Amino acid sequence: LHHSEKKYAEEDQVQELLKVLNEISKTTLTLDPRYIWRSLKDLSSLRNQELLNAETLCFTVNVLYPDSSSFKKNLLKFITSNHKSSVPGSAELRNSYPASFYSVNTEKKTIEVTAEINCFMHLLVQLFLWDSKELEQLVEFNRKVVIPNLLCYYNLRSLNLINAKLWFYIYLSHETLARSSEEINSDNQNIILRSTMMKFLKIASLKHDNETKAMLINLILRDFLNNGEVDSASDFISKLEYPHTDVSSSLEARYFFYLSKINAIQLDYSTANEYIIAAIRKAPHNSKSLGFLQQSNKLHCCIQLLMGDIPELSFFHQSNMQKSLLPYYHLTKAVKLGDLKKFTSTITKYKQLLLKDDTYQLCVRLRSNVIKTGIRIISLTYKKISLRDICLKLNLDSEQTVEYMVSRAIRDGVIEAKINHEDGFIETTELLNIYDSEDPQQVFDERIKFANQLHDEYLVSMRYPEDKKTQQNEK
Template identity: 35%
Template sequence: MVITETTDVEMKSADSPPGTEAVDKKDTDLQNIVEIREQSRQIEKAVSNKENRFISRVLRGLPTTRRKLNGIVLKGLINQLFPQGEKDALLCFVEDTSGGSDADSNTRSRSATKSPLPEVDVYIHLLILVRLIDNNKLPEAERCAQALMQKIVSQNRRSLDLLAAKFYFYYSRVAELSNKLDSIRGFLLSRLRTATLRNDFEGQAVLINCLLRNYLHYSLYDQAEKLVSKCVFPEIASNNEWARFLYYLGRIKAAHLEYGVAHKHLVQAMRKAPQNAAVGFRQTVQKLLVVVELLLGNIPERQIFRQATMRRSLAPYFQLTQAVRMGNLQRFGEVLENFGPQFRQDHTFTLILRLRHNVIKTAVRSIGLSYSRISPQDIAKKLGIDSAEDAEFIVAKSIRDGVVEATLDPSGGYMRSKESTDIYCTKEPQNAFHQRIAFCLDLHNQSVKAMRYPPKAYGKELESAEERREREQQDLELAKEMAEEDDDGFP
């Protein structure tokens, strides 16, 4: 059957026959089968030419292919690519399609006579696993993932590395949806050891991210930090894997009170993430980034909360930012009470609880700027604290930390604020400029590292040995002609 593509698009009339949509759907399914067959040919080409870039190109189009999958397409692929004895092991995972008899009859006549390459087999099996995840058939997805795991582990082929890396991600995803992440931790560690010994950089990057997600899912921050310190994340990993790794690293550093380092990693994760896609990932990173900035004592820009893709998801964090900026403990408590479940779901509730000290510091700083002298009783009333002694201790700690320039007079029972000095007489401007210069230099270094070139592209500009010999021969002939002309001119 020959499928022709036309560039003209015609609108369907309202009085079209009732069977037109079914015919169009059948043609679409057949076209999708042809496209995925072409992808399998690209995989075979990659294996024969030992060029992984063809497999990488096929995997980059997996999100688009994922939307084209259904029972008819998968059955057609299995009937065309697999011989009769190997079909049943895969057809048991495909849903039954009552309306796909015509498409099945068109593809069953061209059944394969021999088994496909292991790479093609793994790719079709991976498509079936993705389809089961999309349909939320978790028991079937677990059995399919176990069968695919046995295929990958039994093979020792370097051409399977990219496909195996993609499988590790979906294998971990199935375990996460089934709430069995702790049961696959040993398997992931063993595959990480194997990938490291084989210099499988893509698989190594995916496995490190899967293990970090596994540890952080159970709040095992110490184990996650040990993993980061013991292994080296490959430099040539894709930007998507780098973005995930930097996000997990930011979560680990924030949990260990290293807010400056966490902020740096989260900013790099936002920079490496796709700008026009992966909206959910960028929202997750931005939520944690807002909390880390508040813990650093900075107030995020209002423009962040006004973005169309961030406005709804960051609404609770906008109210949290307002409470911290104003130093209002009562409003801070209301935000925690109203949005506590969402903060726990975002894994930021523990960090937000630490912001209470920042709210108190902001309130004490505003009190110190507003009053030249104030009693601890009035400070306790403004902070919403019942005890004046607690307010005095809070003020003493704020003075020691440099939050407010003031002195406590125990005999008089008040806090006296010092006169504000010119900030340009201090080192604050120099520190601010240093921070900006360091950020620009780090941005330049990361941009240089992110540059990618086609493999062996430098060889195109170099001449081959044959071309060099021709050029040298032409130079010799030209030199002889010039010598002969000189002899003719001077007898």
């Protein structure tokens, strides 16, 4: 029963262990090890649930351990105690494992594998928390146990790459805890968690390890957004050391989404829009990527309305996420038609909906944006239009009032009109004809610059894989 199940589960894990072991003990190739751990994870998650929950413990005893076993045991008690067929003579063998070393080699005590196995053993602790989807003991106990040990390592290249993935789970369960219940201790523990990430950002920079650097940065910016401090995040991105060196594209997609929120509300929509388009592109497109895709498409459209642009109607209808983009089809319409009355009425319904996705903040300022669009229509239809005529269409209180509103807009240079107060009309001043100005030279500077960027990038990357392949044996 217990022995048959636990050995069979362990045997499938041992195969996975030998894959990681060879890379980390012969010195890593950065790009290829990072990718293998991602695949590893998916198999391991299923294996822990399957064939008892004490297999993880049984595996620990069998493989060399300096004292790692006691960490797994405490964890076992929370999920209901088991310790049978997980002790020596049912859970020990030194032979055929170079990940414990031979019987003769253990006795000499001139061999060392306690290190590298401990780092991965922590993955199991972190997975077991995730598989269960339980909290309580597991949130605080895993956070406590694992972290002094990453600070007990001197922090090597091989070892930092591995421990980067332990952080995700510590963050996610803290946040999940914080949301579930209200106590002041949760606020208290929030500060100590942030500080630990900041400490660890500095150490891994010395060592030039990229996976760790990126990871901490991403988790901590989300924490600033949820509390609503722009100030802390804006100081944190101006430190400016975010790595693109040895990262994944998902990581890049994550980072860009945070920059868009900060930049949009600091009233710089141009650059917020340019990041959010890139965030979507850099991100993979799949149904396990559906949150990201859904929320980045929602946010992007809110950014265009803030500009004064209208997102395409076709964007919303041909999206297969059209059900949740029901509020946004409505707002894009309300702003286009310029009705004040329609904009108020729509936000009143979907107040809650907008509050979820953190697009309600954008909508308060879209109240201003109604007026602006409505007079953009007026500028394009009519070039000379008396003050009264504008007031009748748009139901504006006085001739003086509408002049103040047009002044604000033409200061920012959107409507590009000029008022004649004395002469009692507003005269559109836009007519373009700008191939006669020197402005097309400046447009051409960017396009050549853009093309240049790719011409460097291909070149550097292309020769890089080829080197290894010639260096290595071939058939």
